[PDB]
Amino acid sequence: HMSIITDVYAREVLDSRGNPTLEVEVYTESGAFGRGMVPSGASTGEHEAVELRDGDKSRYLGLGTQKAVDNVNNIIAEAIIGYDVRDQQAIDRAMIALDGTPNKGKLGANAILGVSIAVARAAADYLEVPLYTYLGGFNTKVLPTPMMNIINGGSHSDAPIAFQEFMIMPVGAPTFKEGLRWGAEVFHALKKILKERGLVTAVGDEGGFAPKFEGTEDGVETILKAIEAAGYEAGENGIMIGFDCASSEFYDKERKVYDYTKFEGEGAAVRTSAEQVDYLEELVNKYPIITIEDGMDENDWDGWKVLTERLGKRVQLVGDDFFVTNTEYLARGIKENAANSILIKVNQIGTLTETFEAIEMAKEAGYTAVVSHRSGETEDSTIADIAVATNAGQIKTGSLSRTDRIAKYNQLLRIEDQLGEVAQYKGIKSFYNLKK
Amino acid sequence: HMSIITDVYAREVLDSRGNPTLEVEVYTESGAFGRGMVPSGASTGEHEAVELRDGDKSRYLGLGTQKAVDNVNNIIAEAIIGYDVRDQQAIDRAMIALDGTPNKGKLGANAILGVSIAVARAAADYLEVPLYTYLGGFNTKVLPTPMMNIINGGSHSDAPIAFQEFMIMPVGAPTFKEGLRWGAEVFHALKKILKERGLVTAVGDEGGFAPKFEGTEDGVETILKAIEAAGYEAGENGIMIGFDCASSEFYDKERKVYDYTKFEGEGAAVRTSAEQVDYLEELVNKYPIITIEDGMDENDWDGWKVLTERLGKRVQLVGDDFFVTNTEYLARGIKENAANSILIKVNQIGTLTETFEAIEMAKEAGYTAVVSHRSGETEDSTIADIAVATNAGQIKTGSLSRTDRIAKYNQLLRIEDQLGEVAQYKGIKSFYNLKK
C-alpha cells in the first residue's frame, strides 16, 4: 500500500551497561527496512522524559522494559489500527492529549521517543536520501559543532572533584572532514605531560581526568600543559575552554546561598552564590572562556539571570534542569528574560515534534541547543541525526572512549560526504552575540 | 544488466578509541544500497593478515585507511561488473589473485571483508534470506556464548600478577535465552566488592578493572565466595572461567623458559615446560576452567603433550596465536595435534566465506571455533553473526558493561527470536571437541 496499514511487529533489545530499551517494526509489508529504538537511563522522582521499567526477576534482573513495551504490544493486533506512519504529527501530538501526564509518560517516555524515531526512519533510508535532510522540506545541513571534554568530577570521577566537567573546543576548525582528527588527537595525547615537573599517578574518565589533586583553584598544570603540547597552542586566543557544574546537586534552600564545602577541604572557606559566580568569572576575565554549563538547580529562576547579567556578551551558559528542552520551562526562560543556551538530552524532551519545536523556539534568539549523549546508548546515531535535522548547533558527546559515540561521529562524517560541499561552521557567530 | 552485481561504494570510517577503518557498499541492479564495515587491527612480517594504512602521518599517526578505500573503489569497481550473476565462492574468494600477496596487505583484509559483507548483508536488498542462512548454512538456529574481560592485566602489571585478561564463561543456563543472564550477572557481583575496595579502581576501556591481592590463603578465595554470595554455582554444573594466557609473549624468546619473576616479586618460584602443567593441575581442580586461549608457547614443541593427557577433555585448547585464523596455520595445528580449537578473527581471515570455510575445515578436523573481539570495535554487528551461521556459537566479546560489547547481543537477540520451533537447548552438550 504505502498509504494504509494492516500489519506490524516490535520487540526489545539490550543497551549500554544493562538498561535495555525498545525496538519496534512499523514497516509496511516487505516495503520497508530500517531500525527503531531509543537510548535510556533509569531513574525517578523528577519531571524528566522519565523511564518505565519492569522490576520482575524474569525481566533481566528487573531491568527489562517489556512491561512498558506491553502497552503497545498488547492492545494493537487489529483493533486500534487505522492511523498511518506518513503523518508524523498524527503520531506525535494526537497521543499526548490523551494521557497528559506531567513527567512525560505513563505508557513510556522512552517508548514515545523510540516509536517516533522508528516513524521517522521508516522511509528515510528508503528515499535513498539522508535521514536528517527529509523530515521537513530540505533545510537541515549543519552538523552540530562538537564541544569536547578534558575533565570530569563528582561520582562520575575516580577522584574527589566537584565540577562535573571542564570542556574545550576546536574554534579554529575549518571543516569536519579534517576536523575529525583534532578531537581524536586531544584524547590520544592524554598520557604525556607529568614529566616536565613531576606530578601524580591517577587515571580518569572517557577522556577527562580525575586526579588526587589538592585544591580546586590549582587545576591548571594538568590541563594547560596538555593543551600546549597536546599539539596545539593554549593562550587566550585561537583556542577556548569551558566548564560545567552539575546544577541540581545541592542547594541550601534553608539559607538562600549555595554551598561547595562538599569537595573543598576542611580548611577551606564558605563558597557562596557569588563566590561560585565570581570564581567562574575570574577565568571569564583572564582565561579563554566562552562556554559554561549548569550550576543552578531546577528552579534557579532568578539565578539564570545572573550568569548573563554582568557575564554578558562574553560567555554562553547551558542550563540542564530548568531548560531540559521542555516546553513550559523553555517558555519560562523568556519570562526570566536572560536565558542564553539550553540542554537537549534526547531523553529529556520526548517526541521529535516537540524536539524540533523547542529547538527552533530556542535557537531563534541565538540559543545553542546542546544535544547531549546518555549512558545507555545503542548502535544507531539517531540522536546526532536529530541534532542535525533540527540544526541545533552544539553537541555534547564526551570524548572518544566509547565506540557508540565513535559511531555518532562516523555517521555524521558519512553525512558530510553525502552532503558533499559542507565545510560549514559559523565562525564567531557559532556563539553569535559576542565581541569578547 | 538487470540482474548483475554491478556497483560498489566504500568509504573511510572510525572505531573504538580513535582508529580509522573502512566501510563498503555493494549495489545490485535491483534497488540495493546496503552498508557494512569492518573493525581495525594491523601487523606485518609473517603470514598474518595486514592492513594498508596511509603514509601521511597526519591521518591518525599514519593510521588512515583511505588507501584501502582507494584499493576498493579504483580497483574493485571494475572487477565486480560482468561476473557471475550468482556464485558465492566465485564472487568472494577471488581477491588474493588481485592482491598478489598471501597476507593480503596490498588491497587489504579490512576492505576485502567489507566487500564480502556488503553482498552478504544484502538480505533486505534482494536475497530473501538472512546472513546466517546465506553464508553457507540455511537453517541454523545457534546462539552465542560470551567470554568477557572484566579484570585486566598482562602488560599493565607492576603487581604480583601476570594474566593478560580473565574470561568468565557461562555454560549451564536452563535454556538458550537464559545463557545471556548466566554470564551477564557476574560483572555486577565483581562491582559489588570493587567499589568498596577502592584498591585502585582503575577502569580500562574494556570496561573492567585492575585489582590486587596480597598473598595466598585468600587471594583467589573471593572468586568462589562472591559468586556463592550471589548464589551462582561454580563449575560444569554452574559458572566456569577461561584464561587468555598470552603464553607466546611471556615465554622470553631470548631465554625460552617460563620464568615468572617477570611480573611477580623477585624470589624463588619459577615454572618450566615439564613443570608448568602442574600449575593448572593445582588451579583448575579447585577453581574450574572451561576455555584456555593459547595454552602454552609455540617455541615449546616437545612439551604441549601433558595437558591433553592429564586434563585434556575439560581444558579447551583454543588456539589464536597458534592459528591466526589462517588456512595454512590452522592446517598446521590440525596436522599434528597442537590444540583442539580455533579462535576466529574475521578481520584477520578476510572474508565471511573464508571464515565459513575455516570453520567448516575445523569441523572436519574436529576443531571448535570461536569468533573474537578486536581492539577497534565496530557498531555494525555483522562480524558476530558468522558464528551463528556456522554453529560456532561462542564469542569473545569484551566486557558486556559497555556498548561496544552490548551491540553484538543487541543484534543477535533478533536471531534468537527467529529460531523456529526446534531450538531445544544443547547447552553443556553442545561441544563436539570436548567430552569425546
User: What cell numbers appear for B362 in the block?
Assistant: 575445523
Report the distance separating Cα A122 and Cα A378, nearest Å: 18
Of the candidates A125, A180, A377, the beta carbon closest to that of B403 is on A377
Cross-strand bridge partners of residue A165: A152, A244
Name every chain A residue with its beta carbon within 8 A of the beta carbon of B15: 403, 406
Q: In angstroms, rounded to a whole number, what is the distance separating the alpha carbons of residues B361 and B335?
A: 12
Looking up cell 570510517 gives B13
B195 CB within 8 Å of a chain A CB: no
Contacts of B13 (CB under 8 A, 6+ apart): A410, A413, A414, B20, B21, B22, B23, B37
Which residues lie closer than 8 Å to A108 by C-beta, 6 or more apart? A22, A51, A52, A65, A68, A71
What technique determined this structure?
cryo-EM
Q: Using CA of residue A296, residue A300, residue A305, residue A306, what is the dihedral sign?
A: negative
Task: Name the amino acid, one letter, at A260.
Answer: Y
A418 touches B at CB < 8 Å: no
Residue whose C-alpha cell is 619459577: B270
**Whole-angstrom distance, CA of residue B200 vs CA of residue A385:** 38
The Cα of A98 is separated from the nearest Cα of chain B by a number of Å equal to 32
Instruction: Please list the residues that pair with B26 across neighbouring strands.
Output: B8
* CB < 8 Å to A409, chain B: 14
Would you list which residues of B are annotated within the binding site for substrate? 156, 165, 293, 320, 372-375, 396
Would an 8 Å CB–CB cutoff place B414 in contact with chain A? yes
- Residue B406 near chain A (CB below 8 Å): yes
Phi and psi for B13 in degrees, rounded to 5? -135, 175
Among candidates B185, B402, B410 on the partner chain, residue whose Cβ is nearest the Cβ of A378 = B410
Q: What are phi and psi of A340, to 5 degrees?
A: -140, -20
How many residues belong to chain A?
Answer: 436
Phi, psi dihedral angles at B138 (to 5 degrees): -85, -65
C-beta separation of B381 from B408 below 8 A: yes
H helix or E strand, kind and range, residue A317: strand A316-318
The CA distance from B339 to B328, in Å, is: 15
Q: Which residues contact A8 (CB under 8 A, 6 or more apart)?
A: A24, A25, A26, A27, A76
Between CA A119 and CA A382 the distance in angstroms is 12
Q: Which of B92, B117, B104, B90 is nearest to B22 (CA)?
A: B117
Q: Let me know: does A194 contact A200? Beta carbons within 8 Å.
A: yes
Residue B27 C-alpha, separation from nearest chain A C-alpha, in angstroms: 12
Angle in degrees, CA B371, B375, B377, rounded to 5: 75
Residues of A labelled as active-site residues: 206, 345
The amino acid occupying position A214 is E
- For chain A, domain boundaries: 4-128, 129-436
| Helix segments in A229-351, DSSP class H | 273-285, 303-306, 327-336
Cβ separation B379–A407 shorter than 8 A: yes
Q: B145 has which bridge partners?
A: B394
Distance from CA of B204 to the nearest CA of A (A): 9
DSSP state at residue B317: E
Between CA B129 and CA B114 the distance in angstroms is 19
DSSP A12: E
Cα atoms in the Cβ-side hemisphere of radius 13 Å centred on A155: 3
Annotated resolution, angstroms: 3.8
Nearest in space to A124 (alpha carbons), one of A428, A380, A409: A380
Q: C-alpha angle with apex B35: B33 to B40, nearest 5 degrees? A: 155
Extract the C-alpha cell encoding A24.
519496534
Grid cell at residue B3: 540482474
